[PDB]
Design a protein around this nucleic acid. Structure first.
Ligand code: MG
Ligand code: MG
Ligand code: MG
Ligand code: MG
Ligand code: MG
Ligand code: MG
Ligand code: MG
Ligand code: MG
Ligand code: MG
Ligand code: MG
Ligand code: MG
Ligand code: MG
Ligand code: MG
Ligand code: MG
Ligand code: MG
Ligand code: MG
Ligand code: MG
Ligand code: MG
Ligand code: MG
Ligand code: MG
Ligand code: MG
Ligand code: MG
Ligand code: MG
Ligand code: MG
Ligand code: MG
Ligand code: MG
Ligand code: MG
Ligand code: MG
Ligand code: MG
Ligand code: MG
Ligand code: MG
Ligand code: MG
Ligand code: MG
Ligand code: MG
Ligand code: MG
Ligand code: MG
Ligand code: MG
Ligand code: MG
Ligand code: MG
Ligand code: MG
Ligand code: MG
Ligand code: MG
Ligand code: MG
Ligand code: MG
Ligand code: MG
Ligand code: MG
Ligand code: MG
Ligand code: MG
Ligand code: MG
Ligand code: MG
Ligand code: MG
Ligand code: MG
Ligand code: MG
Ligand code: MG
Ligand code: MG
Ligand code: MG
Ligand code: MG
Ligand code: MG
Ligand code: MG
Ligand code: MG
Ligand code: MG
Ligand code: MG
Ligand code: MG
Ligand code: MG
Ligand code: MG
Ligand code: MG
Ligand code: MG
Ligand code: MG
Ligand code: MG
Ligand code: MG
Ligand code: MG
Ligand code: MG
Ligand code: MG
Ligand code: MG
Ligand code: MG
Ligand code: MG
Ligand code: MG
Ligand code: MG
Ligand code: MG
Ligand code: MG
Ligand code: MG
Ligand code: MG
Ligand code: MG
Ligand code: MG
Ligand code: MG
Ligand code: MG
Ligand code: MG
Ligand code: MG
Ligand code: MG
Ligand code: MG
Ligand code: MG
Ligand code: MG
Ligand code: MG
Ligand code: MG
Ligand code: MG
Ligand code: MG
Ligand code: MG
Ligand code: MG
Ligand code: MG
Lengths: 111, 175, 141, 76
RNA sequence: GCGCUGACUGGGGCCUGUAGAGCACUGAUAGGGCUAGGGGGCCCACCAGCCUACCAAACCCUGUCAAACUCCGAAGGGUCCCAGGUGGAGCCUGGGAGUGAGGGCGCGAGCGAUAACGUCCGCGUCCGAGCGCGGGAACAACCGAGACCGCCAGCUAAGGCCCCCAAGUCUGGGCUAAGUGGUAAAGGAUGUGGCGCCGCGAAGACAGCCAGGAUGUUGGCUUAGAAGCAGCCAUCAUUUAAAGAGUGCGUAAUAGCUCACUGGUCGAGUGGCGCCGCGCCGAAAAUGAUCGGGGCUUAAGCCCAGCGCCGAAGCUGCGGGUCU
RNA sequence: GCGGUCGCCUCCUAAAAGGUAACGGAGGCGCCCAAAGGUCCCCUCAGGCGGGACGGAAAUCCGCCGGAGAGCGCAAGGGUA
RNA sequence: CACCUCGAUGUCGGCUCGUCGCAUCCUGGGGCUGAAGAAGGUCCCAAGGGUUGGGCUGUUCGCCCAUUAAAGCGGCACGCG
RNA sequence: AAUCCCCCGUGCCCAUAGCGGCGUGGAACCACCCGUUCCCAUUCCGAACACGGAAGUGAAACGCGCCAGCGCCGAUGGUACUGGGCGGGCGACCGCCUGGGAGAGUAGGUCGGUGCGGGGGA
RNA sequence: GCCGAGGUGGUGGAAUUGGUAGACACGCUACCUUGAGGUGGUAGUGCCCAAUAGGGCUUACGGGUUCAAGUCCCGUCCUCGGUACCA
């Protein structure tokens, strides 16, 4: 069994994003935590990091997400970065993935 | 069982020329070294007829040395089916891979007078120690039976080492 | 005589014969063989006449091999006609044979016998030939 | 004869080679399938036709498993 | 008018899927192996059912083929950049055209018959328009060479240097005996000169020449008799240095002869397989024969080396013309 | 003349850019689809073996194996999970 | 095939007159024979000469009658208006 | 921040990183897991998707190692072919010079390498 | 002389798309039937040692192909449709 709905859906949505040219607001979410990474392709380089497992916070992971959401803005917007795309990878734009995006407010956005 | 050759060294000189001068181009190689040489065609032929990638050639060669080499490929030009380049493989202390003749021994093998000898492979690929090198291999069983088959693990297999893949293959049958 | 059943395309160009025997080429089934010295198209009806000549001079045992096969469609107009309007028409099949190739090749017979058969068999061919035995060199595999 | 037909040669192929200077618009490759894929600053039309999106120069990229790519690296 | 951009060349990048090869796909395909099911041949007719001397899928080995197959893939070619390249180069605008029947050759293919001074394309070339010059006996396109004019000067190219016919009857070393050269093949042959492998051979072979040939016997079978010598055969076995119930004659089945066999003599090589060079046969057409001719045989032929010379309208020297 | 052909697409011929001929080798078009169109979200085939009432080579189902040999309205090619 | 000839190279057969080739029909000379002799078969040499008259059909060709040493095959613009 | 080890992200190279066998890892990360109230869900199924949680497990997955049976990569010689230049054969085709030079196969090689960013260590 | 088809028991003739015969027919012999026959119905019947069993020979004749040939390949004779300058 080569490649999986996971790996597939992952490329599918992520490949489209990488065409538009913008900086990528990649979102990896785990069972316990949710992390966020602003990457620049063609330079193969990350610019602004913002995890929850790095901000040692907890209590309802939909609300944690938004926090690490707003956390990403602050750190980033202070580096000039304003406009970006927003990955979303394998995750449907919903719950804590949608939450973090809604948190990414106070920083460029359009999402 | 022991065959002497001779040899020389190559660097320049077009193989075309050597060829013209009765000499037969060729390379000498193994895990450690690789160098181009040339034998004498008239000489080499005499040896290889009997040698024949089955037995070991010692290869004299200035340098006074005497190198344990099997012949692992003979390129002969199709137009005259004569050889045009030999490449000699030199042995060291590490199990090699080779072809060993198959002394079809026994008899008409069961149901005698008669049956079918069914000759498949006058050789066989074996991973063996460069030290002990079987001159051939006894292939008897008894024999034998009618419509049977000596696979491969049924064969003698002297204290060389073992087979070379192909656990199950013809080698014997009567029909 | 001897044609290849089911063909993707009937009627094929003709190409040249500058080759030198793709291979081949080194005997691989019998004790003796007939090798092609010249390039030619060998006709199924030429092969069948070479085969028979041997099985015949072998009492009936015997053990040919042939090794060449007529897969090339040979065409030819209906004569008494002029160029243009379709192509040949197919009147048989040939095997392409450049020098080096081993045709036929026999086994399970004496030498003064196999060699006499191969000679006969050779007279049925439009090219010059050569009889071989098979030594180490042949064991090219 | 039942044959005799054929169609007009479609003059397909690459139109700009690597290290050639192009301009926004210049079509860079005419092809049937996606023999080449649109890289950086390279669009592709409904007939799979690759063209410069901006001015600059032409460079090719063989991403093996990922196929071959035509990029228009700017300079404008 | 612009003016170094031109063909061609060097370096560099990118594009390609042919030559070759390959069998991984599409098909074709030799042999063997192992096995779907059938041919079957059949037990039943309830499961069934055993075997494969025809298939034959796949699968595995060993082998191969393909313009419309490709896991591969040169050389080359295309294009852009940077350089060289001043050329009856390039580019731009315009005036005048003619051509739109090509042909031979080389190379690459298709058609054709691996026919045509055939036909159709491709890339080159020449003739076309160089039917001007030299060579090729003669001959548009094969070789040499691009003819502005004059010279009773020189060097050369192809090709030549016995005579027609300018320059070697030049120097070496080999080959050929056919007039080969002055040709046409499969195939064939103690032609001749070389190279090589093998068999036997001073325990003495190979030629010849001496010596002897069984014996139960007719071998039996067939069969008046086949007694080796009608035939079918069972073709014995002994003995011997050594003779096959006998290879050929003989043949009223006999007689007699003779041979494969061993001994002796003589004594030295002898028999076979390849390989190359040059020749030989294969080889019959119509008006008069011939390599262009005469003529040529350690060459006036063929191969390998050399040194010179002859040789064009090419090149040079001298003078001249015209254009730029 | 008779016959065949006449425009368009695909493949080869075509000599690895483009192009390239013959009464050269083979096929196809003269439509079609209001969803077979746009976008967003999900999903991944064909086969092969084993398993499972009526199910049989093949209807639907479960298991493993399966990089594409499936599919993409129709020819061929290129393309494509 | 379409190369000279369409500002013309008259086209079958016969007659006449030949001439040449030899892959020889007869006659001469041979080898082999499954050649007793005689008579044949088959192959080799040999082109000097010879190679009939009729019926039918425009015919060439062919069938046929009567013979013969034999009733030869071809080329010469299917020789020759 | 330096160097380094492990882990989670995300790239790039695009099989030497792959298949398969074996062995390892749960403190931390990750997964599975525990539930289906709530957002949201499955043409049926909380399998997926999704949320809220965390007792348990590294069985599955994933990560990291080892093994060359397969897969993949693969010289060096030597050829085939061929720019260009010359010869040869009635041809079908063949040979020489000078440059370029595969394919198969042989020797071998390989069960990854690395960029940026995190979390945890030394 | 030239291309294609076919030659079968005493007669007519089928299997002719690859696998074990000289079918069902008309004779002919016996049997049923009839007073006896004809017709019709059984069964023998290509050939030869065969009580049957079963050996072996048959597809115009001869020679090869294949494991197997009435069939595919040729050769001779027989026959049927064709068909042979030339302007
Ligand atoms: Mg090969
Ligand atoms: Mg055309
Ligand atoms: Mg086309
Ligand atoms: Mg490439
Ligand atoms: Mg310049
Ligand atoms: Mg140019
Ligand atoms: Mg250049
Ligand atoms: Mg390729
Ligand atoms: Mg090829
Ligand atoms: Mg294949
Ligand atoms: Mg296949
Ligand atoms: Mg097979
Ligand atoms: Mg090809
Ligand atoms: Mg193609
Ligand atoms: Mg490669
Ligand atoms: Mg170039
Ligand atoms: Mg270039
Ligand atoms: Mg310049
Ligand atoms: Mg000009
Ligand atoms: Mg102009
Ligand atoms: Mg004008
Ligand atoms: Mg015109
Ligand atoms: Mg024209
Ligand atoms: Mg033309
Ligand atoms: Mg021209
Ligand atoms: Mg031309
Ligand atoms: Mg000419
Ligand atoms: Mg040439
Ligand atoms: Mg020609
Ligand atoms: Mg022409
Ligand atoms: Mg030329
Ligand atoms: Mg003209
Ligand atoms: Mg001229
Ligand atoms: Mg000119
Ligand atoms: Mg003239
Ligand atoms: Mg002239
Ligand atoms: Mg002349
Ligand atoms: Mg001339
Ligand atoms: Mg001039
Ligand atoms: Mg001049
Ligand atoms: Mg001079
Ligand atoms: Mg000269
Ligand atoms: Mg002369
Ligand atoms: Mg003179
Ligand atoms: Mg002299
Ligand atoms: Mg001399
Ligand atoms: Mg003697
Ligand atoms: Mg006696
Ligand atoms: Mg002369
Ligand atoms: Mg002057
Ligand atoms: Mg001027
Ligand atoms: Mg018409
Ligand atoms: Mg092209
Ligand atoms: Mg399935
Ligand atoms: Mg199933
Ligand atoms: Mg099932
Ligand atoms: Mg497809
Ligand atoms: Mg399609
Ligand atoms: Mg396709
Ligand atoms: Mg496709
Ligand atoms: Mg004409
Ligand atoms: Mg013409
Ligand atoms: Mg006139
Ligand atoms: Mg006139
Ligand atoms: Mg004769
Ligand atoms: Mg006579
Ligand atoms: Mg007589
Ligand atoms: Mg006589
Ligand atoms: Mg004569
Ligand atoms: Mg009349
Ligand atoms: Mg007459
Ligand atoms: Mg008539
Ligand atoms: Mg008469
Ligand atoms: Mg006459
Ligand atoms: Mg005529
Ligand atoms: Mg006339
Ligand atoms: Mg008149
Ligand atoms: Mg007349
Ligand atoms: Mg990671
Ligand atoms: Mg790969
Ligand atoms: Mg693994
Ligand atoms: Mg464990
Ligand atoms: Mg694991
Ligand atoms: Mg624990
Ligand atoms: Mg814990
Ligand atoms: Mg585990
Ligand atoms: Mg894990
Ligand atoms: Mg390789
Ligand atoms: Mg190499
Ligand atoms: Mg290679
Ligand atoms: Mg290792
Ligand atoms: Mg860190
Ligand atoms: Mg009967
Ligand atoms: Mg009564
Ligand atoms: Mg009564
Ligand atoms: Mg009565
Ligand atoms: Mg009665
Ligand atoms: Mg018959
Ligand atoms: Mg017969």
């Amino acid at each position: 069994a080569r490649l999986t709905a996971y790996e597939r859906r992952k490329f599918r949505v992520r490949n489209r994003i990488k065409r538009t040219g913008r900086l990528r607001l990649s979102v990896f979410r785990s069972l316990k935590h949710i992390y966020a990474q602003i990457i620049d392709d063609e330079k193969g380089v990350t610019l602004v990091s913002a995890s929850s497992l790095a901000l040692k916070l907890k209590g309802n992971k939909t609300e944690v997400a938004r926090q690490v959401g707003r956390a990403l803005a602050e750190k980033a917007l202070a580096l000039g970065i304003k406009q970006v795309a927003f990955d979303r990878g394998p995750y449907k734009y919903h719950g804590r993935v949608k939450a973090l995006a809604e948190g990414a407010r106070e920083g460029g956005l359009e999402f | 069982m022991e065959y002497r050759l001779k040899a020389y060294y190559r660097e320049g000189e077009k193989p075309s020329a050597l060829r013209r001068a009765g000499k037969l181009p060729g390379v000498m190689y193994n895990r450690h070294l690789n160098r181009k040489v040339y034998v004498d065609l008239v000489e080499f032929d005499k040896v290889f007829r009997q040698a024949s990638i089955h037995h070991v050639i010692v290869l004299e060669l200035p340098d006074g040395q005497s190198l344990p080499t099997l012949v692992r490929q003979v390129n002969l030009d199709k137009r005259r089916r004569r050889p045009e380049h030999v490449d000699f493989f030199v042995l060291s202390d590490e199990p090699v891979e080779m072809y060993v003749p198959l002394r079809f021994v026994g008899t008409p093998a069961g149901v005698r007078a008669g049956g079918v000898l069914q000759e498949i492979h006058r050789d066989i690929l074996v991973k063996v120690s460069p030290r002990n090198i079987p001159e051939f291999i006894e292939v008897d069983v008894s024999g034998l039976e009618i419509g049977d088959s000596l696979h491969a693990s049924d064969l003698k297999l002297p204290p060389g080492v073992e087979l070379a893949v192909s656990p199950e293959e013809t080698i014997a049958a009567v029909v | 005589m001897l044609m290849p059943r089911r063909m993707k395309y009937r009627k094929q160009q003709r190409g040249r014969l500058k080759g030198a025997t793709k291979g081949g080429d080194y005997v691989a089934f019998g004790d003796y063989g007939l090798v092609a010295l010249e390039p030619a198209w060998i006709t199924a009806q030429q092969i069948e006449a070479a085969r028979v000549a041997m099985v015949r001079h072998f009492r009936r045992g015997g053990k040919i091999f042939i090794r060449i096969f007529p897969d090339k469609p040979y065409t030819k107009k209906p004569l008494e006609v002029r160029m243009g309007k379709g192509k040949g028409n197919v009147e048989g099949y040939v095997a392409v044979v450049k020098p080096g190739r081993v045709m036929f090749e026999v086994a399970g017979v004496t030498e003064e016998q196999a060699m006499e058969a191969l000679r006969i068999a050779g007279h049925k061919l439009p090219i010059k030939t050569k009889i071989v035995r098979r030594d180490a060199y042949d064991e090219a595999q | 004869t039942r044959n005799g037909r054929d169609s007009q040669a479609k003059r397909l192929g690459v139109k700009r080679y690597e290290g050639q200077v192009v301009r926004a618009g210049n079509i860079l490759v005419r092809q049937r399938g996606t023999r080449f894929k649109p890289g950086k600053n390279v669009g592709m039309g409904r007939d799979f036709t690759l063209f410069a999106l901006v001015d600059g120069v032409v460079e090719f990229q063989d991403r093996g498993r990922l196929g071959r790519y035509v990029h228009v690296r700017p300079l404008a």
